[PDB]
Enzyme design. Sequence first.
Site, PDB file in Angstrom:
ATOM      1  N   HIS B 198       4.519  -2.400   2.528  1.00 39.35           N
ATOM      2  CA  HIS B 198       4.506  -2.844   1.141  1.00 39.35           C
ATOM      3  C   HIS B 198       4.291  -4.344   0.997  1.00 39.35           C
ATOM      4  O   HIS B 198       4.011  -4.805  -0.113  1.00 39.35           O
ATOM      5  CB  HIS B 198       5.809  -2.439   0.453  1.00 39.35           C
ATOM      6  CG  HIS B 198       5.786  -2.620  -1.032  1.00 39.35           C
ATOM      7  ND1 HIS B 198       4.621  -2.825  -1.738  1.00 39.35           N
ATOM      8  CD2 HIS B 198       6.783  -2.618  -1.947  1.00 39.35           C
ATOM      9  CE1 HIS B 198       4.901  -2.949  -3.022  1.00 39.35           C
ATOM     10  NE2 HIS B 198       6.207  -2.827  -3.176  1.00 39.35           N
ATOM     11  N   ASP B 202      -0.368  -2.991  -2.158  1.00 40.80           N
ATOM     12  CA  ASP B 202       0.307  -2.683  -3.406  1.00 40.80           C
ATOM     13  C   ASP B 202       0.422  -1.172  -3.593  1.00 40.80           C
ATOM     14  O   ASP B 202      -0.358  -0.390  -3.045  1.00 40.80           O
ATOM     15  CB  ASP B 202      -0.451  -3.299  -4.584  1.00 40.80           C
ATOM     16  CG  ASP B 202       0.353  -3.290  -5.866  1.00 40.80           C
ATOM     17  OD1 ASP B 202       1.553  -2.951  -5.813  1.00 40.80           O
ATOM     18  OD2 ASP B 202      -0.216  -3.623  -6.926  1.00 40.80           O
TER      19      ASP B 202
END
Lengths: 236, 227, 227, 236
Positions: B198, B202
């Site tokens: 992450h 995105d």
Amino acid sequence: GLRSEHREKMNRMRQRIAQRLKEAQNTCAMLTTFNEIDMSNIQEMRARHKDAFLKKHNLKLGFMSAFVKASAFALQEQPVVNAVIDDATKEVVYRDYIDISVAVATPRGLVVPVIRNVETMNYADIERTISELGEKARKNELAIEDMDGGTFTISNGGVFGSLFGTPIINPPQSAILGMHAIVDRPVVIGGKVEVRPMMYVALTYDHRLIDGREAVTFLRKIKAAVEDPRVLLLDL
Amino acid sequence: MNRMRQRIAQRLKEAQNTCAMLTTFNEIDMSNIQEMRARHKDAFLKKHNLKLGFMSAFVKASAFALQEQPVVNAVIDDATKEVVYRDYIDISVAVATPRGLVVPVIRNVETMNYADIERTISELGEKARKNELAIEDMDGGTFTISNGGVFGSLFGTPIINPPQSAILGMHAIVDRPVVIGGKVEVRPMMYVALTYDHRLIDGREAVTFLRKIKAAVEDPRVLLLDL
Amino acid sequence: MNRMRQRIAQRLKEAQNTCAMLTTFNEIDMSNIQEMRARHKDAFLKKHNLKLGFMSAFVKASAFALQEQPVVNAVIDDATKEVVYRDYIDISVAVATPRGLVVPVIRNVETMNYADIERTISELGEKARKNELAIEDMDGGTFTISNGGVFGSLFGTPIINPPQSAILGMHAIVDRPVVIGGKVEVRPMMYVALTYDHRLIDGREAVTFLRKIKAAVEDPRVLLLDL
Amino acid sequence: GLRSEHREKMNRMRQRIAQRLKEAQNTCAMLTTFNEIDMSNIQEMRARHKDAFLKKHNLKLGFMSAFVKASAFALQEQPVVNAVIDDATKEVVYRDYIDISVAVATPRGLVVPVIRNVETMNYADIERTISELGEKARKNELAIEDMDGGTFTISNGGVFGSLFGTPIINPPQSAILGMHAIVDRPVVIGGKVEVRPMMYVALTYDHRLIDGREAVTFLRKIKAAVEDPRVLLLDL
């Protein structure tokens, strides 16, 4: 074949974002619990109140407001889920107020405004605030004080077609709700298989502060408040 | 605990302590691939002396999706604070041996058909069945496909192989009721899970990448259209 | 009769007096291509700003068939008594203009997707709509696809463009009754005719080449399998 | 992209073959006429006489013999189609005998043996000669005298899946019959659409010697003799 490894240097703020993201996992003890919500009632409500609502308020009736209000009701029911744990002082600070951060989409990216004191809002007020912040953030003029200090979060991965997943807690909170795409699926209603529009919902909670039973009951409360909105009036 | 198993455990924990891992799931309708292979298998076997599995379809679809979104093919290097991109694309696929499971690498998959991918998979599966598999045939994959389906799992969260940014985990094919054109119907479906770092990728990017893989696997003709 | 039209007639007669021409016909079930484009057209238009016709499918299928059988891609030179092969493959496709019909060339079609072929076809169709089409964009095709379908013909015998060994002539799509699984059924079909120089290409080779084109056009997934 | 034009020189005999092929077109005035044959009867006959035929003659009952015999009958009916035109002397030489050249397939290529005096042969004799020449030619020992001087030809493009096409006359003849693949197609039997196994048949004839009416009637005679083999016995 061919090989090439051009590259770009990570800027200051993106590096800060990554560091903060890792700190979020290294602070909380995160777990996830899932459930399914029957979206028939909200769709049926809006598909006939949309026209008069548009005329009255000059606004489009989405289902985001229903989820925001249901989450606010569930939080009001269970204060502990609205609280946060502060390691800097070894104190579990509660909150009598409730404000919710909702993610909005822009071509440049996604950002998370805040809705202040949602406990005193109708559907119309929530929709108006969402639209105002979505158009205000479409232009870059969104200040820090409109993004600082949310107690609870609702993440929108549904608009992109995801089925279900595990969101990550925004640092200064104890939980986050992640919605997902609505899909027509076969379900059993009264002992007979039937087709309804369903959607999976995932909750990520900090297991240090919130017990598993509390998280499950909170998610079921959100489900109850979203399936039959009249539960909000009964204070049930 | 021997030296190398301890090293493996340390590396595994370092993988979690480096990346910020999350998972997102989806479902793929496997009717088209099954229907294709159930009639092209015989002529394919005669032509190439090979068995037409569905692994090649997934590998090619993942290669197409990676080519579409370069960021998912990139990796983040903390030692220098740089996000190194890659113009090439090679994929590591897990193979099964009685002694265990290992992960060869397929070099430059962007220029391969289904036949080439199947041939490389078979060659490495028979070469690794015997222990003579060297390091250079296992080093430096950019993306991974994990196979838990053959053992009957429904869905789960895989773990990123250290020098990458994502991993695709397939699962067992099960007949399930689905809604096709407003009517409940029975089709062979399978859950697919993606684990992504992450920090670099995105959530929207990961979801769109998974949907791209789904689109490329449900209707293989999307590969030709470059759609 | 002007100079150039007389030259065209002389060249046309020389084409027959050089080659030993024969024709062989077949029928292609166009259900799959129509079904593909009738649902990938919108997203294809958005992605590439182009209209998804079925010309690209035929061009790519013919390229695949030519790659399979090199002899059909070769030409026979009487000036030296040599059968010159070609490792490359470029295809000439006829375009329509109000003033007449002309035949641009698509260079090195073996490395093109459907999108690239469609883009080149559109670019040359708009470039030739205006008269600025130069010789080097029309010289030296190895294989040809002729379009008589748009005018409603059923089937006919085309004539080989001089510097080649074969030509494919498509025709109009008509709904006709056919037998699918022992039962009469209605499908959109089209007759396809191939004219080949019998000096260089054997009848069996021509028939197998036409069947290969049929196989590649009925089920486009054959292109991926390299089957 | 890339370019490369490696090449091979045409040998003597292939060049001779090409020259002969062009001479074939430059000598005759070739045209083609097509028709369709209902193959139900032959398939039904062989699908039940195959076993006893195999036991009796140690042979496989194909449908090539039926076509050869039908063509022989048609040729016997119309002598002109069996004749050839000689330009070297300005004479139309007839023939009282009838021998037919049938193409056989080998991995190295295709060749055309000859069946001598087919007018006195049954189906068994034709099948035996075809098998003997097909196994004799599989090995390269096939001499010239077994390939020289056919009066009529039957070409087999069906085994490769062609639908219909125009064959080219073998030089020293006046016609050639080209068979094609058998496909199930809908046809009208007694005013009602029905499914039958059909096949297109093409005849190429030298228009200098054979009139269009003669060619059409000859093709219809072959059709009549192949659809209902009992026509052979009736001499009808």
